[PDB]
Structures are given as structure tokens and as C-alpha cells.
Design a protein around this ligand. Structure first.
Ligand SMILES: NC(=O)c1ccc[n+]([C@@H]2O[C@H](COP(=O)([O-])OP(=O)(O)OC[C@H]3O[C@@H](n4cnc5c(N)ncnc54)[C@H](OP(=O)(O)O)[C@@H]3O)[C@@H](O)[C@H]2O)c1
Ligand SMILES: NC(=O)c1ccc[n+]([C@@H]2O[C@H](COP(=O)([O-])OP(=O)(O)OC[C@H]3O[C@@H](n4cnc5c(N)ncnc54)[C@H](OP(=O)(O)O)[C@@H]3O)[C@@H](O)[C@H]2O)c1
Ligand SMILES: O=C1O[C@H](CO)[C@@H](O)[C@H](O)[C@H]1O
Ligand SMILES: O=C1O[C@H](CO)[C@@H](O)[C@H](O)[C@H]1O
Ligand SMILES: [Zn+2]
Ligand SMILES: [Zn+2]
Lengths: 357, 357
């Protein structure tokens, strides 16, 4: 079968050939439909994040996948079920408490593999296998855009933890600020528009000149575009307002620290970005005083698990159809797979199509 | 009546005389028994925190008080009840949503007064009045050390919020690290020893040379003393272990940032210190990456409300008697009030006695 992989030393994704896998007991065989591409995949290709499987020359990419079950084997899945795989799997040493208690998303470094990212091959192959417990059934009609379920689930987890941090008092937020106009940030902005917390004012930070299709999406959602070149995060409360909820999706470390200054009293910032090393001079006193005297919280979040994927299927149905059309700028057949890794300003979310239902 | 106050421009606390107050409707008249002194009071005397009441030449100090009801007026309190007042009161402009919903501890700057700290006189007077709703009845036998209920309540709130931040997954901590060996830090260390979360290993950071009575208390609680001059917070995991829970009570901004490096995966730091301005070069990338990839949280907390004071009465009963004897290094009659504001290494928690039951 064909797969899309990065090879050690090499700079770009290439096609390789591998044998079709066979499911072991408790696993199903899945025929890949579509696999999404995101910022993390680019960071994996560049060497900034993740790592190869032990004793392998390559890493099959892709962690945002939707497929169809072709052989249920000895599982309770049915032939033709549409499934989305979770990303984390137990490491070489075997299972551990995080997997046994069904919270692998909380496992630390070295206690997991992430398919397509660290220590295990991803889903950009014609077929793959997975254990039934890591395959989430989704409604058949979400098959075409089912690669969005994984990134949606990322935000479902982040919101669960951020909101939990505010659960000891009566918190009623009205403003939300998304940092970053990538596919994760834009998806999250749309999710916040339909969130039960009832946000009245939405804002999204980027650094693009008009005309730009990410700006168009932000404004079409009735949100305000904030240009960080004009208004840095720390200055936002002077120009606009203090933000009850901040979701960071830039991977820029300055935003992790400065977000505290933009938060309203009793607010929380959720941090999702995978940053590079970076040192600078911080007013630590300002950071410290704001956190304490205004009862603020910062919560980091990575990965997601089954319940978050399930929640994502509900959120998906609430998203405007125009938004999903505008977000997904290209779905490319395997024959043109290279196009999916192009990253210019007009490329928002891409995917590679391996097969159709 | 006599009161202990700081006067504008002046450097030290002095005795002043004021008329005995009269309770309005819904208020009781309380005869002050004992009022504690803490780090915040010293910061108020120095001008680093708080502020005077509008149109007043002075501020009566003291926010940690226990008293006896002498006139219940038209309240449901009874003559002779032992009470501890809460600290926050509505500002000049009147009540607001935070007070109406019974969460004044969440009110931002300008939406509260704090008696003895900002905008309103404290409790270092022979008598004071308060609304019934802000007077917490405590068991009569806690009268002698009842000024500890307020600082205990501070930690009760901080723990509620920190633990709430971890409530979306199965968190079972085993290690806790208290930063600071002041009266708040030491009290909190003892509370953690009896906490239901079941901490096995306790640690407390200070910067004293032996012999020192704060070191003695830490070791007598079966905790490990960490000297920050030898082992800074960021290096603690190399020398000792990663900490599931960190409670910051130094007011040193470096600790607010560095605590993230000392946290175990999925851990939370609670920040309580009231810091001074301070800038330095931070590895922001390290901060950001740890928060995200290891699902960490930081929560700030200030003040406390009735439910926290109630909880404190239960915690009080669990604290070892030897510990309370060692923590309270002097209770001074009003005649020797100056002694209570002495701050040398051997002074831990002090109080001023105005009267006895
Ligand atoms: N925590 C998790 O489990 C998890 C899951 C998914 C993704 N992530 C991380 O989340 C981040 C976003 O993911 P993504 O797929 O949306 O990445 P992306 O497509 O690269 O989006 C990042 C966006 O941030 C913008 N940006 C960067 N610095 C900025 C600045 N200083 N001011 C304003 N905008 C700035 C970029 O704008 P320009 O294009 O103009 O440079 C870009 O559009 C990445 O770091 C990714 O690794 C984490
Ligand atoms: N959030 C709230 O509602 C609230 C409530 C109460 C108190 N607080 C704050 O909490 C903090 C502690 O209160 P407290 O009454 O316990 O104050 P404190 O008596 O002044 O105790 C602070 C302790 O921290 C130690 N310390 C300072 N810097 C250090 C460093 N770099 N390394 C190791 N130890 C260091 C000091 O040691 P040395 O004596 O050796 O200098 C001192 O013993 C203060 O900032 C106070 O304002 C906040
Ligand atoms: O993009 C991602 O990066 C994360 C870190 O590799 C991983 O945990 C998530 O499953 C994935 O969505
Ligand atoms: O020491 C304190 O400082 C806090 C800030 O002034 C105040 O809110 C608390 O009630 C008090 O315990
Ligand atoms: Zn992704
Ligand atoms: Zn106090």
C-alpha cells in the first residue's frame, strides 16, 4: 500500500510503499478516507516536534483521520462503520495507569506514543489498524469532513479543563479572545460562537494585511480581527476590552505570558500552542500581581480522548455550513498530495483524500 | 475607645482614640478579643499595599480578628457568641453583583473595601460593628486562637480553586511544596499534612540558617526544608522530586514563573503572594511548553468568604496542638502592642490582646 512519510535527514514528505497491515485481536482494519494536515504536521516535518519510531528510517504522517471499517475482526464494530481514530497509544514498555484509567491524554512524556507525531506511524496510508477502544464511530454524513473531529476534540478538552478551573464560583463570561488565525484558532472561534457559556463579544488575533481569507472568516463570524502588529495582546484591554476567556493557538511564548494582562478579573487563559525556545524580559511582578489580586487562571492542554471526540460530533452539527466550506481550502487526491503541504496565506485547512465511501 | 492605626505620612503604628461605634440595623456590636498580625499588615504599614479610607488621616489596622458579641441588636446572633469577621465590605458606591451573589472574594479592584487594608478601618480597636452576614460564629473553645481562622480560610479558598482546576480528570497527588516559611506558609504546610488528598511527601522553601524556629517547625511536621540559596525552585526536581501541588506564599515574582518548572505533569500551582514590581529575563518557551505538553495549571487566589471560614473551624481542630503552640510566638496585651510588629527571624505569628472572654 502507499503511505506518505518523512524520511530521516530528508526535508519533504514522500510516497513510500508498505505492506497492508493485519489486525490483531481486538483491532479492526480501516480503509483511510481523508487525513487532515495542520501546523503540528509542519513542525514534525521541520524537526521542531515529535520523533521517529525506534529502528525505523521514516515516519508516516497524519493524526487527523477518518476511515471506514473494512474488517471488524473480533470487535463490536460493523463493516462500513465510519470511524475516527484517537492519537495516543501505549509506548514500547506497554500499558500504564493513564491508559488503564482511560485518560491517555494526561500521560506525560515517555508514557505514550502519538500516531503521526511521536514514536508511531500515523494515518496517511491506504489502510491502518487500531484497537476498537481507540476508534470513535461518527455519523455517516460527517465522513467527508470527518478529519475535523480530531482538532475539534482538542478544543473540547481545553474548554473542559479551563471551565473546570472556574467551577468553584459563579462565572458568567461575555468576551472571548482567540490568539491565532490558523485552522485551530478559526475552528475554535466558531465553536465559541455556539458555546453554551453565551459569549457576546468575540475577538481573534492575527497579523495579516487585507485582503486575506482568514480575516474574512473572522468578520463573517461577527468577530473582531485584532492585528498584533498594531495592537499587541497586553494593549488589547485599552483598545477593546478585558477578555473573560483567552484561547492561545499561536505557539508564540510571549502570548502565554502577556495573556494574563489581557484577561478580565476571574478570567482564564487556555494554552494550546507548542512553542519553540524563547527568552525575553518579562514584568514578572505584573504577571504575579494580576494572577493573585484578580483571581486569574492559566491552564495548558494537550491531546484529547474518546469523550472529547464524541462531544465533537455534536459541536460539528452546530457549525455553520458556510464556515466549513470556507475553512477547508483544499482536499487533494493522493495523486496531488504535495499540494496539501503548501502553506501560503490563502491555505487554511487542507486534507488528502485516499479513497471515497 | 483605643485603636491601633497608621497615620498618613507616618512610619509606625500608633494608638489613637475614637468614639465607640453604634450598630445600625442588621449589625452587631462586637468586643475585640485578639487580632493577628501578618505580612500583609507590614506591607500596609510600609505603603506597598492597600490605602486609607477617603477623607481620613489614618487607617485602623488588623484584618485577622476574633471577638465576642456584646450587643446583637436586631440580628439572630446571641450575646456572648464568639465571632470572626470577614474582611471585604461593599465600597462607597454601594452593593454590587459580587456581594449580592455572596462571592465578594471574587470582586475586582474598586468594587470592594477590605477592612484594615484598603478603604476601610480594620479591627484593632476595642469594639467594632459588622453586619450579621459577615460575622462567622466559631466554637467557643477556638476563641483564644480565633485570629487564625482568617488566614486558614485563605488557604481553604486557594485549595478549593486549585483542586477545581484538576477536577476534569483523575488526579491523585502525592507531593506538595510550600514556597515561603512565613505564618501563611507554615500554616498551609500543616493543613496539607491533614488534607484528604493524602500527600506523602511535603516540602517547604525558605532561606534561613540553622538554628531557626521555622526550620524546626517544618522538620517537626515531617517535611523537608529546602533552602532557596542552595536549591532554587527550578532545580528542585533534580535534587528532590517534581511536585504535584505548589502553594506560593513568598510574594517573590520569580517563584510565580519558576514554579511551572518544579511542577509534576498535570500539577497545579496556587499563587497567593502579593508581589512588588520586578522584571527579569525568563525562558518563556520553557514556561509555555511545560504548561501545554504536561497539562499544568496556575491559579491565583485572594481573600475568602463565609464558607471558607466555616471550613477553617474544622481544619483548626485537626491541627496538632504542639504546632499551634510553636507557630504563635507572642500574644501581646494592648499595653505592649509595639512588640507585635517586631519582625525578626524568631517571630512567626503574633497577635494583640484587647480583652479576654
Ligand atoms: N495542544 C494541542 O494538543 C495541540 C493540538 C493542535 C495544535 N496545537 C498547536 O496549536 C498551534 C496552532 O495550530 P494550527 O494548526 O492552527 O497552526 P498554524 O496553522 O500554524 O496557525 C498558527 C497561526 O498563528 C499565527 N501567529 C503566529 N504568531 C503570531 C503573532 N505573533 N501574532 C499574530 N498571529 C500569530 C500564524 O499567523 P501567520 O500565518 O501570519 O504567521 C498562524 O496563522 C500550533 O502551535 C500547534 O502545534 C496544539
Ligand atoms: N492572597 C491572599 O488573600 C493573601 C492572604 C494572606 C497573605 N498573602 C500574602 O502571602 C505572602 C505571605 O504572607 P505571610 O503573612 O506569611 O508573609 P511573611 O510573614 O512575610 O512570609 C513571607 C516569607 O517568605 C520568605 N521568602 C521571601 N522570599 C524568599 C525567597 N526568595 N526564598 C525563600 N523564602 C523567601 C520570607 O523569608 P525571610 O523572612 O527569610 O525573608 C518570609 O518568611 C505575602 O506576600 C502576603 O501579602 C496573601
Ligand atoms: O496537533 C496535535 O499535537 C499534540 C501534541 O503532539 C497532540 O497531542 C494532539 O493529539 C494533536 O492534535
Ligand atoms: O492578607 C490578606 O490580603 C488580601 C489582599 O489584601 C486580603 O484579600 C485577605 O483578606 C487578607 O487575608
Ligand atoms: Zn491536528
Ligand atoms: Zn492576614
Amino acid at each position: 500500500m502507499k503511505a506518505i512519510a518523512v524520511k530521516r535527514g530528508e526535508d519533504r514528505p514522500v510516497v513510500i510503499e508498505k505492506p497492508r497491515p493485519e489486525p490483531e485481536s481486538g483491532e479492526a482494519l480501516v480503509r483511510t478516507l481523508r487525513v487532515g494536515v495542520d501546523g503540528t504536521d509542519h513542525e514534525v516535518i521541520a524537526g521542531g516536534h515529535g520523533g521517529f519510531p525506534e529502528g525505523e528510517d521514516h515516519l508516516v504522517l497524519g493524526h487527523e483521520a477518518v476511515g471506514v471499517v473494512v474488517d471488524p475482526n473480533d470487535t463490536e464494530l460493523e463493516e462500513g462503520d465510519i470511524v475516527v481514530p484517537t492519537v495516543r497509544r501505549p509506548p514500547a514498555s506497554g500499558t500504564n495507569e493513564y491508559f488503564e484509567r482511560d485518560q491517555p491524554d494526561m500521560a506525560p512524556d515517555g508514557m505514550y506514543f502519538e500516531r503521526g507525531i511521536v514514536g508511531a506511524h500515523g494515518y496517511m496510508s491506504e489502510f491502518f489498524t487500531s484497537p476498537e477502544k481507540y476508534l470513535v464511530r461518527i455519523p455517516r454524513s460527517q465522513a467527508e469532513l470527518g478529519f475535523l473531529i480530531e482538532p475539534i476534540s482538542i478544543t473540547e478538552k481545553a474548554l473542559e479543563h479551563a471551565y473546570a478551573s472556574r467551577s468553584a464560583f459563579d462565572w458568567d463570561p461575555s468576551s472571548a479572545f482567540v490568539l491565532g488565525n490558523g485552522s485551530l484558532g478559526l475552528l475554535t472561534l466558531a465553536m465559541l460562537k455556539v458555546d453554551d457559556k453565551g459569549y457576546e463579544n468575540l475577538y481573534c488575533l492575527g497579523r495579516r494585511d487585507r485582503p486575506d481569507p482568514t480575516i474574512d472568516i473572522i468578520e463573517e463570524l461577527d468577530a473582531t480581527y485584532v492585528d498584533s502588529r498594531q495592537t499587541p495582546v497586553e494593549d488589547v484591554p485599552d483598545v477593546y476590552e478585558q477578555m473573560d476567556f483567552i484561547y492561545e493557538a499561536t505557539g508564540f511564548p510571549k502570548h502565554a505570558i502577556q495573556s494574563v494582562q489581557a484577561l478580565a478579573p476571574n478570567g482564564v487563559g487556555a494554552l494550546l500552542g507548542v512553542p519553540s525556545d524563547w527568552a525575553f524580559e518579562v514584568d514578572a511582578g505584573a504577571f504575579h500581581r494580576e494572577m493573585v489580586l484578580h483571581n486569574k487562571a492559566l491552564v495548558g492542554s494537550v491531546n484529547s480522548h474518546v469523550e472529547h471526540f464524541e462531544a465533537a460530533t455534536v459541536t460539528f452539527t452546530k457549525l455553520p455550513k458556510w464556515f466549513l466550506e470556507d475553512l477547508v481550502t483544499g482536499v487533494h487526491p493522493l495523486s496531488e498530495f504535495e499540494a496539501a503541504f503548501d502553506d501560503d496565506d490563502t491555505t487554511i485547512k487542507t486534507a488528502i483524500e485516499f479513497s471515497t465511501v
